[PDB]
Design an enzyme around this catalytic site. Structure first.
Site, PDB file in Angstrom:
ATOM      1  N   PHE A  14       0.874  -1.195   0.000  1.00  0.00           N
ATOM      2  CA  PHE A  14       0.000   0.000   0.000  1.00  0.00           C
ATOM      3  C   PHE A  14       0.913   1.248   0.000  1.00  0.00           C
ATOM      4  CE2 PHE A  14      -2.887  -3.059   2.129  1.00  0.00           C
ATOM      5  CZ  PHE A  14      -4.046  -2.844   1.471  1.00  0.00           C
ATOM      6  N   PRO A  15       0.575   2.258  -0.819  1.00  0.00           N
ATOM      7  CA  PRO A  15       1.350   3.484  -0.958  1.00  0.00           C
ATOM      8  C   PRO A  15       1.000   4.458   0.164  1.00  0.00           C
ATOM      9  CG  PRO A  15      -0.534   3.679  -2.325  1.00  0.00           C
ATOM     10  CD  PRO A  15      -0.603   2.286  -1.712  1.00  0.00           C
ATOM     11  N   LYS A  16       1.344   4.066   1.379  1.00  0.00           N
ATOM     12  CA  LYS A  16       0.953   4.800   2.590  1.00  0.00           C
ATOM     13  C   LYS A  16       1.967   5.829   3.059  1.00  0.00           C
ATOM     14  CE  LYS A  16      -1.994   1.178   4.586  1.00  0.00           C
ATOM     15  NZ  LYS A  16      -2.067   0.168   5.617  1.00  0.00           N
ATOM     16  N   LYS A  17       1.468   7.030   3.310  1.00  0.00           N
ATOM     17  CA  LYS A  17       2.194   8.094   4.010  1.00  0.00           C
ATOM     18  C   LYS A  17       1.455   8.509   5.282  1.00  0.00           C
ATOM     19  CE  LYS A  17       4.474  11.066   1.576  1.00  0.00           C
ATOM     20  NZ  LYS A  17       5.022  12.074   0.638  1.00  0.00           N
TER      21      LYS A  17
END
Lengths: 249, 250, 250, 249, 250, 250, 249, 249
Positions: E119-122
């Site tokens: 997941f492209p989580k920030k």
């Protein structure tokens, strides 16, 4: 209780009849750690063309939006600026034409307006770092009229090209009314910054958002796209300049 | 979405052949409703005052009128407060006032004031307010309270016609602007007359004034020898344009 | 000890055969002193506007008048602020205004507004105030600022007789009330004329407006193409009863 | 930025000529965890009889003072209510007649007033637990006009009897002026709550205190004695109702 | 005194031959109770979307589903909130969603999310809350509100079975990890299916969405042409492990 | 005006021949919904524990179960939180728990706890809450944090039937009350069984505990050698009356 | 870090089987600057008679409403009290019967309830001076349930008579359930304060206001009229007492 | 409104299939005024031995506890770090093995973990001066898990020996699971800091206190005694590194 003043002894600009209460001292003015954050964007070339003075040409349909931190400025103090500069060519020479400026300190405002002719108004510009983002917020009264962001020093930028840019002339319209409501002064001035050191320079992703305000219509110059993002830090000197055109002559 | 009515340089209020896109102050005249004056006149050293006056201007009395003026409803300029020092003078045989210091909390009237007429305006935080039984004026410059004035609230009436005659006296000012090369560009004495004045009320009473020093606002240099008058009045008036009466660069 | 003057429901303000004991608003007419208008008129999509108009109502121009109105002294309703959108229209050969959105911070005028004339009023937090050089209107709906208007303070005079003529124009409203069974009970067009109007002052200047979306206050649907006018004026006037001019359930 | 609206396409009550700006949607309305706190008290029967509309019977000279917490209400949201309900008899059918109601959310106010005819005003009721006590406070502006306390869930109450009570019809005067100042609507309406579940019910010691307000004169119905104290939590549905009398015909 | 149950590397949850002493996230699967979704689907530019998609993945519609998800009770990961953008896609003929942006207020699910599934989580500050009659989602990244979503609270029911079928669709993700030398180490497309899903409730209603730019969270780049759906639903579900379906370094 | 439903003392909850007018707690049984347990069991000096046990009570293991219990919905007693220490014991061939310390933030359950069963309860400020990824228990006594417990949130499932079997174990308590002349009046061992228990969920994970000294809450005397277990579980259950199983004054 | 405790060695009440966690130590208890503010009022004698235990005489139908400041109390600390005491007669001996008591410290609550049998509950009483007025406010949760005012030390009061009053026995019902829900203890106790010094005593105008609370129903004893107003400061000792009736035998 | 991005054009790590949303830019990364405060302490050698990867040897039974202020880090921003490093020997080479790290900025966390394999978690480390003390406080959620103090620059420290120390290799376990829950990456990496300048260095008295936390068990490595105290300030570069062992190979 005492003041070192007393009184019209300090006649900084050599007025035959001086004003007792001073607002700003004489220059030149030295800037240490003058820090620039600039987001250049494309806009409508016609809006820009309409604003320029006679014989001045638009180099490109671009506005350079800046935040400038001036924490150590001789004579002027510790303040911040934001505004809009247009790349121009005048009489064969490339430079910049300032169309808007906002500062949080009155001495450089009165000085900027009355000496060179910077179109300066009072507001609340802020430049700061929050984690991995460099942020600029320009507030005018209760309203946030510009928000710019950048990835913090993501890549370096050629400091020599930046120096070349900072060395370019500063063109301004110095317009001052007469006490009778007609024009007293309507001049194009040109000034060159001196003794510049670019201590560092960087680029990275950026953003700009503008919001309207009847008395700070910077949003009129709408953003078609961002063309460049720069952060650099300098020491430099702001000296006196020269009148290059007098429209009242 | 959004918009601004502006665009731009179409609004050229002072008829500049080559206008500036970003305006700071509109054209006048400027109308003031409930412009409220609190003035404490005091005697000071005449030599200090005379040293400050331009050529050929005479000091009427060794007196400074220290003022706080509330301007809640000012066309073009807004809602703001001012405080400053005015000296009574005679110029070419005409009695008036010479403004030596002025401080306001709004930039529009600052820029307009300095650039049109030549008022010696700086930015600060003046306040005029009532606290129970006292009218108070506090002038703060940065962190520093540089003037405190107090007065007994409307203790006695003051002759409104006499106040009107005072407000009608010309306003003399030194309009001084550098050239971009650092030498003088403008050094003029201007004269302006307030118009359409109504004195809606006027009072006097006991008063006090305290001053404190500041390098960039040396108002305390004009020290207080004694208080010679205390006034409070409220008005409606107009600030129109004025005229150049001396040019020292000529 | 304690007491209420009522008891009552001897207070049958609208002459109901069977009155409700708890009243929410009194009977008019209603008098407003220093009812202060700030209006930014803007061009929008004429098709959006047309779609909203009731039968046989014609759109005068593809303009929305966005307003902030300060009502500090309103008989019966109190001290409150309003923001909304009004469209210039023609109905049966008569020009007036059709109110499409309205937001108040006081419930008495909300309920009375909706239930008497048919104003489309919702609760929110509009604010009109001056900061320095600028007149500001902010409409907050919950946590969300859905409209921000600004104006240069009283930059120029505005013809007050023209303003008066505008304030005198009929107010058209769709009064829509469901039946308790969920079908329509009332669907009327009402028309009301403001009376005993005094325009005490009027001004124009540079202006701006910004709109933001909200699911329950979708004012931003009426997007701004350009600002066409900016007005500020102060009045005393009376809001009386009106009449039903169409019944869509007939 | 965008709104899903566009526009008068959303005509929830099937108006031939709809209003663009909606204030409440159509029902029925589902309530989860609708929580009631009711202090029933004896008062002056003559004051009550004076308030009731024609042909309505006062069952007993009792006011049921309520705080109702509605944290999850379809269409109307998250809000709180307080008010006064009288036990009555209309055309032989026992029910409740609401004589005062105060909510902290405008959508259920406008909807309540305009659909069924609840006598709703804007205020600040709160229902909360502090330690050992269940507390209801109704604030109208700056003034606390009612304060109710109860010992928390001290004893059980028969949920079956509670259910029977909740199933009883809701009787309301729906009164709307004409734009010309005369009456437009003056109806008695009757509505029945549906799909009710009483999930819990308790009793315990209680207290009530009232204070005057010119625009919320609830204290006019003074307290002779507390006759019952109830706390219960439910799931239920508020549907549409019917007109049972028209005083204008 | 004190103690920790740990010590240590005895808790090797992912069966590393040479474990790391300091753990960041436990092993799953992970169970979610009252995982609450608020989604506003909007049409945007298909070219922008197609440019972002990996090889061989097809765009189903020119639509982004902007979400806020509240996760108050998440085994292993905790109590947190998320907001992000998901695109409807087809991969190898299977319809699902491709997550292009995600922001959470808790690091455990951030690290776990990026490192397990990709997941492209920030890290940011998403909030989902009810305000009177409105469900609101606000995504703040540092000082900047980059997304504001609103919806009319549970205005109409939504078919729960249809929501269940949507939640059952595979989750596609680009799992991208650099090598310590700065070149690619991992560049995989992963596929995961949510399990044991109960849709406990579902609704729709009027909605709004506003986006603002940010250099480090360029979500506004996927501009809104129009809103095409508004959903609110609450669930219990399980997030288990998944599978690699493409390896671009192969 | 005003009123209380009581008067009374017609409310004689415990059937006193001569009742007290002001009641502090009602009669049970008492029902708890979402009674939530967080327990860190730790090894300590067995001699310390032995010294504390009453006659004929045997220590099962040199372990203290340190607990935080959240009671948000307790009939008769309200909404409150508890922290304490419980020792595993054997009494007359039956295994259960002996409570040696307990701290609550609500007086009704303090007085009722002490006076009915003999719980050794004092007033303090225990708190159980989740922050991100972590379950936290803090016990504050006055200004002093005397216990801090942390746990990884629901990292692994725990067998709920084992938890249930544990909750079903007898609660042993020393009920000690002085006589008004300063000598002992009551010195009993009571035994009580929780009833109608449902374990709605149960979990384990990494844990920590830290203790700090206090002259009036000397829990830190029972020093931690090592943590032996970490548990989190949620229940519905009933606290009924119990029985006297020893009278030390006989 | 260390505690001086270690451990069940501290058995203050000589329990054969002591509890490790202590809540209060043994007495007697010394009070310095114990400060009393008492508004005595007439009420309904029948309500009072109903509360009193068998064979206790009501001396007069008066409630003595008190605020007591205890800034320096050995064993129990620094706290404040408010409550209601009735003048009574038991076996011919005049004394006081405490019917309600509220303190802001738990040690004196548990000790008070468990040793002598004071009817103590946790609340927030305050006794303070503001300007010209002595003020007592008793807050129970979020609700102010009593408010007392007095003109500050307006006139002297005879300290000798005050002393006589303070020397009178303290009568209390000590009521403790059995773990099984039935009564374990139901005793009347009698205690005499010792080593009393009245350091000052005054009177003046006074006021009292009561408000209802389900769990602190002090307002039930309504105010017919104020009969006395007293302020006095003392040093005194609270020792052990004796059982004078057992309703379980 | 505009972003300079657009879109997968900036593929910083040269992924054949890049991720649209970036978290961290490519290095190398320049650090200006990177300020280290380190308290080295002796601990139980067995705890440490158990943590080390294959063939790695403990140089001494010591943990180096650090706070590091990074106010100007290209690409990563303005943040603070705290953690634990162990002195080790690997394959003949002396360096450090990082076992715990906590940062207050996500970009260097995701970057540190995903590039080199630093065992980084999010927390709230602070480094600051208060009068004559340099203080480091590491807070994890609500809990203060480490507090270190030092006498401010009491004595100088040989800057050349510090440089030698900073030049030592950085050994890390880079452990990343597969989407299926098994290991994907399990590597020992080695990295060398470059272009280092030690601008200043000092020693003085110091202290360290640790507190437990289930999810930051740094207190497990208990303090037998402090063996060294250092404060130094540097400019340096963090470049890419190399894999020295693959345990999945």
């Amino acid at each position: 209780s005492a003041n070192s003043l007393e009184g019209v002894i300090d006649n900084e600009f050599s007025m035959p009849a001086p004003r007792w209460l001073n607002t700003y001292p004489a220059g030149p003015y030295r800037f240490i750690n003058r820090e620039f954050f600039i987001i250049a964007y494309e806009t409508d070339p016609d809006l820009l063309q309409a604003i320029l003075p006679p014989d001045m040409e638009l180099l490109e349909p671009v506005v350079k939006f800046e935040f400038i931190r001036m924490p150590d400025s001789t004579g002027f103090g510790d303040y911040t600026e934001s505004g809009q500069v247009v790349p121009v060519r005048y009489k064969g020479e490339e430079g910049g034409f300032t169309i808007s400026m906002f500062l949080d300190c009155h001495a450089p405002i009165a000085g900027g307006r009355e000496i060179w002719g910077f179109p300066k108004k009072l507001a609340k510009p802020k430049l700061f770092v929050e984690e991995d983002t460099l942020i600029g917020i320009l507030k005018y009264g209760s309203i946030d009229i510009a928000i710019a962001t950048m990835g913090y020093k993501h890549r370096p930028l050629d400091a020599e090209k930046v120096l070349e840019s900072v060395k370019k002339p500063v063109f301004l319209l110095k317009n001052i009314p007469n006490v009778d409501g007609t024009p007293l002064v309507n001049q194009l001035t040109k000034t060159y910054l001196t003794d510049i050191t670019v201590k560092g320079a960087w680029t990275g992703p950026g953003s700009l958002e503008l919001h309207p305000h009847a008395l700070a219509p910077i949003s009129n110059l709408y953003i078609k796209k961002i063309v460049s993002v720069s952060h650099f830090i300098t020491d430099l000197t702001l000296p006196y300049g020269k009148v290059v055109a007098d429209y009242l002559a």
